């Protein structure tokens, strides 16, 4: 008795990488999808064995290729950090530009909005992770990074927001760091790394950090008790991580396919490697993003042949 | 420094006048750039 993930088809309407991904609650029919096409896709999934319905938006703003992208918990926003050392927040209906985040003084990396959509943080390539409002203004300004800081992301709370508000980076400098938004100081280094990591995420309870980057190394820390836990070998180069709503899986992007992990019982459950066609084996495109669907039945994949792969969780025989 | 030597220029005058002498020291400085010749984890 297996689980199996099955290819349900593609979407495409990209000219870049699709570099980033992230999906709704209020709407689970929307994907939001940021690429090195300068522009930003929303679109309406009607979910066919070959082909996805309909392409809603497009957001053209961003001088230079969109790097990162969020939604939010309804729907209505969307959050892009592009190369133009600007960030910008849309609506997903119109694609009205709501802010222009300028502030950054290099490529913003990596962008994500907190909990009750209030707090939006930004890390670049000038070693800066910043803080801002809804409102498009800095109130913070978080240095701390020796290398570039190549992903920012907000850890979920499991007391109701009980005074602590913490975020997680991932620097170049070969450590991730942990830190605490209400006096705004360093709160943990996690250091362990042996080269440059290029993703970082937070388990949906908040407890669990997963690093990876060009070693191959996904590296598992515990938050809560600031102590790190192992390592799971994911062999190439891993540019994406994110795990999974209810499971207990964890997904990563590597250069060679999607390696799909168990942490309970621990096993590497599936690797995903779709096939194409005319490459050779040292051309063939890679995962650059993935999102997990609101259920943790569908995950959604950016590649780098500017198509949105798209997989199901079944149960086989 | 040498800087003194080469560039900065002092002249006193002892001025004489109806109640007494007074000293007047002029300091010129002229501008040099016309001078032709396991993974561990911390916490906090």
């Given at each position: 008795?297996?689980?199996?993930?099955?290819?349900?088809?593609?979407?495409?309407?990209?000219?870049?990488?699709?570099?980033?991904?992230?999906?709704?609650?209020?709407?689970?029919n929307?994907?939001?999808?940021?690429?090195?096409?300068?522009?930003?896709?929303?679109?309406?999934?009607?979910?066919?064995?070959?082909?996805?319905?309909?392409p809603?938006?497009?957001?053209?703003?961003?001088?230079?290729?969109?790097?990162?992208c969020?939604?939010?918990?309804?729907?209505?926003?969307?959050?892009?950090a592009?190369?133009?050392?600007?960030?910008?927040?849309?609506?997903?209906?119109?694609?009205?530009?709501?802010?222009?985040?300028?502030?950054?003084?290099?490529?913003?990396?990596?962008?994500?909005?907190?909990?009750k959509?209030?707090?939006?943080?930004?890390?670049?390539?000038d070693?800066?992770?910043?803080?801002?409002?809804?409102?498009?203004?800095?109130?913070?300004?978080?240095?701390?990074?020796?290398?570039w800081?190549?992903?920012?992301?907000?850890?979920?709370?499991?007391?109701?927001?009980?005074?602590?508000?913490?975020?997680?980076?991932?620097?170049?400098?070969?450590?991730?760091?942990a830190?605490?938004?209400?006096?705004?100081?360093?709160?943990?280094?996690?250091?362990?790394?042996?080269?440059?990591?290029n993703?970082?995420?937070?388990?949906?309870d908040g407890?669990?950090?997963?690093?990876?980057?060009?070693?191959?190394?996904?590296?598992?820390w515990?938050?809560?008790?600031k102590?790190?836990?192992?390592?799971?070998?994911?062999?190439?180069?891993?540019?994406?991580?994110?795990?999974?709503?209810?499971?207990?899986?964890?997904?990563?992007?590597?250069?060679?396919?999607?390696?799909?992990?168990?942490?309970?019982?621990?096993?590497?459950?599936?690797?995903?490697?779709?096939?194409?066609?005319?490459?050779?084996?040292?051309?063939?495109?890679?995962?650059?993003?993935?999102?997990?669907?609101?259920?943790?039945?569908?995950?959604?994949?950016?590649?780098?042949?500017?198509?949105?792969?798209?997989?199901?969780?079944?149960?086989?025989? | 420094?040498?800087?003194?030597?080469?560039?900065?220029?002092?002249?006193?005058?002892?001025?004489?006048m109806?109640?007494?002498?007074?000293?007047?020291?002029?300091?010129?400085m002229?501008?040099?750039?016309?001078?032709?010749?396991?993974?561990?984890?911390?916490?906090?």
């Amino acid at each position: 008795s297996n689980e199996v993930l099955v290819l349900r088809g593609t979407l495409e309407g990209h000219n870049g990488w699709v570099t980033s991904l992230a999906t709704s609650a209020g709407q689970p029919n929307l994907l939001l999808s940021a690429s090195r096409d300068k522009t930003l896709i929303s679109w309406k999934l009607t979910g066919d064995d070959q082909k996805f319905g309909v392409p809603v938006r497009s957001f053209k703003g961003h001088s230079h290729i969109v790097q990162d992208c969020t939604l939010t918990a309804d729907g209505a926003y969307a959050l892009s950090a592009s190369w133009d050392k600007t960030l910008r927040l849309w609506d997903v209906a119109t694609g009205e530009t709501y802010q222009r985040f300028v502030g950054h003084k290099s490529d913003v990396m990596s962008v994500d909005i907190d909990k009750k959509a209030s707090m939006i943080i930004s890390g670049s390539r000038d070693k800066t992770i910043k803080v801002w409002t809804i409102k498009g203004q800095c109130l913070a300004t978080l240095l701390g990074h020796n290398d570039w800081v190549s992903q920012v992301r907000v850890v979920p709370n499991e007391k109701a927001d009980d005074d602590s508000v913490t975020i997680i980076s991932a620097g170049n400098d070969k450590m991730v760091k942990a830190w605490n938004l209400n006096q705004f100081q360093i709160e943990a280094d996690f250091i362990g790394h042996n080269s440059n990591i290029n993703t970082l995420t937070a388990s949906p309870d908040g407890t669990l950090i997963a690093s990876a980057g060009k070693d191959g190394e996904i590296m598992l820390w515990n938050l809560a008790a600031k102590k790190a836990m192992y390592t799971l070998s994911a062999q190439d180069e891993v540019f994406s991580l994110a795990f999974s709503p209810n499971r207990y899986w964890l997904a990563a992007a590597t250069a060679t396919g999607i390696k799909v992990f168990s942490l309970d019982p621990q096993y590497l459950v599936d690797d995903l490697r779709p096939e194409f066609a005319g490459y050779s084996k040292a051309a063939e495109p890679h995962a650059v993003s993935l999102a997990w669907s609101a259920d943790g039945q569908t995950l959604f994949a950016g590649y780098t042949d500017n198509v949105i792969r798209v997989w199901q969780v079944m149960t086989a025989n | 420094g040498q800087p003194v030597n080469d560039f900065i220029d002092t002249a006193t005058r002892h001025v004489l006048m109806r109640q007494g002498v007074l000293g007047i020291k002029v300091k010129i400085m002229r501008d040099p750039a016309k001078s032709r010749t396991a993974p561990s984890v911390k916490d906090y």
